[PDB]
Design a protein around this ligand. Structure first.
Ligand SMILES: Cc1cc2nc3c(=O)[nH]c(=O)nc-3n(C[C@H](O)[C@H](O)[C@H](O)COP(=O)(O)O)c2cc1C
Ligand SMILES: Cc1cc2nc3c(=O)[nH]c(=O)nc-3n(C[C@H](O)[C@H](O)[C@H](O)COP(=O)(O)O)c2cc1C
Ligand SMILES: [Mn+2]
Ligand SMILES: [Mn+2]
Ligand SMILES: [Mn+2]
Ligand SMILES: [Mn+2]
Lengths: 299, 116, 299, 116
């Protein structure tokens, strides 16, 4: 049986990603969020509800990625160095999911928190959204998988990392771009910094597998990738309609969803499918935070 | 004007093909002795790929401007490989674009290089 | 679908282990090992060969634990907080495996390193040792597992964490207890600090499952646990015979193996099966290092 | 002499049953008004469980000695919960043992407490 040997490269990318993972290491105790209370009480009821609902949705998605996505993909990789990178990315998915609870503890009482999570557990749209992604993962719960099954799991994973998170990331960035809930925004920005490189990495691996597929299987996965993209888009539009109608932001979030869907496609080496539009400038301002500069290796 | 570029995951390479301009991928031996524009991608924390740095050490006399590909997810570190090159060698930033660029990124670039 | 909620305890232990995992975080760049060259050239040929061979064996075991052990167990846990802890432990298994290459790079040329890993890949005793442990893991590659299958995977994991590593850990500790290869010994001590809490954690989880089993299944897993213990002991004695005969340390390592086998049993709540003997005092001295004091949360 | 103890994963509890001495598990309300020996387990980096600390804050007048369960894998932090208690309250360390203890740990303990 093979042991992992880092003195002999298995690929051109894994070492670069391994080191970047660790340079980006962080934990929720580095960011006190209590000072956000001052702006949180200035939001309306409907704004507070949307903020809690999107955080619950993000928690669910990170839960599935750390607990199913990363482990089930990595167990079937033969590249021991890439497997290592995915194991660390999987651990950071759990740091992310836990960091949302750090935010909830400041903004809500414990009875309000239980209500949010009961709402998440029983929401039919989240159940279908998460169900579609994880069905590609659960197909990998068997000893032998085909390269086509593994490719489609990586596509599903890229679509989660680079695309499905962003209908939820939108609102913390929008508020932080206006000077509201900026501590929580700093945590969301650290999460995004991680997910950005997660999506790139899995997309690289998917492109390597795509090249091993037969001409017939390449056409099959190309068709299914386009169908999956559009199936998830239909769900995202219903989701944004439900979350953001009360606060008049639906068209803004939909634009932001298409913008990140295009980035997810490019992570896979594919051409964009949605028209090019400019990122919302307030969201762009919420992406500007000094905490994203922190390199674990310098201090 | 020559376009010298480097790419790791293909985004800059794909942007290059949109330009319909003469372009060459840099390596450690490459010597350009004509005016050129550099397009680089951005590495962690807004940095310049080491191969680009080593290339410029020998070729900075002909450098007329720099564009950077990046990801706006990096906030103030978006495309900051261009900032470091622009100040180190006192050449303008041509532009910054995300991943493979939009068609507006392409026309902005071409119009910017005609300005130089 | 459930998302993980850290504001409501799922058990009495997971939060304590989560925080300890992170407080113990480290990476190989924190320990320069180059100064070990001065003592490495003072070892005989047979001592150098045994040191490289045990490190290769450890690399294999950490490879399987990060890439099969942790992921396959954690995917079937319903406790979302415990699942989180295992995902982080799995990431640290990959930090451990990589740290061995950091050591090899200082002590050996790249052609010597390739020989070690070819030796590891094709060694029949390591193949059987690793094969026995991972057969319990691979049984979990299916959508539905029984509690008996999950219990036995956790037993196999505890036996790896608390017992099978230690025929390899012995020699770096023995040398470092004599002032030889002390930088590499500091890395081995950080690894041991992690594996110590890994074994405790998985043993707690196994004890919770044991209590859910029927009276008949409890008797069945108790019998199979004893057989597995003794089957692995037979293999360890052949392994120590092969590694340590040339340097006259076989009886010392065998004693150390039984001593840690007893700790592994106790992690599972079971009584010791080997006679009580004192730990080798030179090994004990190799366990005394100041770097084990480092808490990520203080600085 | 009374034995007061705390245990999280059962090792100290199982050691207690070997002693055949009167023993009680501590809680936050517990008031001992007889001489006693404390046995505690050791938490990360050689520390004392917070419940033991809070218990001693109210009961340290009757404390005659301390034993600690630990794991020698922790090097110099093996059983160091006894060191901290011994210096803070100026009572002897009775003993240190690993996990549930060996039969030599048991006889050493009993012989040590008869010495006190
Ligand atoms: C590890 C890593 C770190 C990155 N860091 C940054 C960054 O700090 N700033 C930025 O704008 N883009 C950053 N990026 C994004 C890349 O610059 C972007 O994807 C670019 O299009 C890559 O170009 P290429 O495909 O030609 O290699 C990073 C990408 C990776 C994989
Ligand atoms: C998170 C954790 C940290 C530990 N830290 C130490 C330590 O620093 N020093 C030590 O000697 N033992 C340490 N131990 C070992 C325990 O003290 C030992 O297992 C003891 O028997 C536990 O007692 P209990 O089963 O009664 O709870 C640690 C155990 C855990 C789970
Ligand atoms: Mn995440
Ligand atoms: Mn991710
Ligand atoms: Mn390990
Ligand atoms: Mn371990």
């Amino acid at each position: 049986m093979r042991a992992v040997n880092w003195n002999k490269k298995e690929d051109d990318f894994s070492l670069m990603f391994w080191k970047q993972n660790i340079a980006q290491f962080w934990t929720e105790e580095e960011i006190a969020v209590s000072s956000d209370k001052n702006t949180w009480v200035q939001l309306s009821k409907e704004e507070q509800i949307a903020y809690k609902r999107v955080l619950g949705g993000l928690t669910l998605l990170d839960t599935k990625q750390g607990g199913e996505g990363m482990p089930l993909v990595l167990v079937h990789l033969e590249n021991l160095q890439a497997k290592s990178v995915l194991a660390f990315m999987g651990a950071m998915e759990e740091v992310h999911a836990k960091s949302y609870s750090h935010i909830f503890t400041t903004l809500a009482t414990e009875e309000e928190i239980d209500d949010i999570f009961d709402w998440v557990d029983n929401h039919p749209l989240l159940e279908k959204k998460a169900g579609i992604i994880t069905s590609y993962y659960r197909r990998l719960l068997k000893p032998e998988v085909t390269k086509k099954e593994l490719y489609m799991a990586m596509v599903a994973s890229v679509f989660l990392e680079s695309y499905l998170f962003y209908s939820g990331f939108f609102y913390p960035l929008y508020l932080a771009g206006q000077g509201k809930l900026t501590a929580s925004g700093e945590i969301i920005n650290l999460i995004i910094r991680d997910e950005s490189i997660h999506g790139v990495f899995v997309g690289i691996l998917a492109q390597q597998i795509f090249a091993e597929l037969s001409a017939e299987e390449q056409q099959e996965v190309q068709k299914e990738t386009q169908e999956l993209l559009m199936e998830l888009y239909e769900i995202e539009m219903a989701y944004t309609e439900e979350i953001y109608t009360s606060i008049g932001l639906v068209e803004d979030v939909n634009r932001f969803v298409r913008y990140n869907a295009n980035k997810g496609l490019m992570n896979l080496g594919l051409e964009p499918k949605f028209e090019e539009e400019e990122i919302n400038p307030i969201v762009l301002n919420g992406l500007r935070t000094d905490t994203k500069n922190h390199d674990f290796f310098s201090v | 004007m020559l376009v010298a570029y480097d790419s790791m995951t293909g985004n800059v390479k794909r942007f290059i093909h949109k330009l319909n301009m003469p372009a060459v991928q840099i390596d450690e031996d490459l010597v350009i002795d004509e005016d050129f524009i550099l397009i680089t991608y951005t590495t962690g924390f807004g940095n310049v790929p080491e191969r680009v740095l080593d290339f410029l050490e020998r070729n900075n006399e002909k450098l007329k401007g720099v564009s950077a590909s990046g990801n706006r997810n990096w906030g103030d570190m978006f495309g900051a490989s261009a900032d470091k090159i622009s100040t180190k060698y006192e050449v303008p930033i041509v532009s910054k674009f995300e991943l493979s660029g939009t068609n507006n990124d392409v026309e902005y670039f071409k119009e910017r290089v005609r300005e130089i």
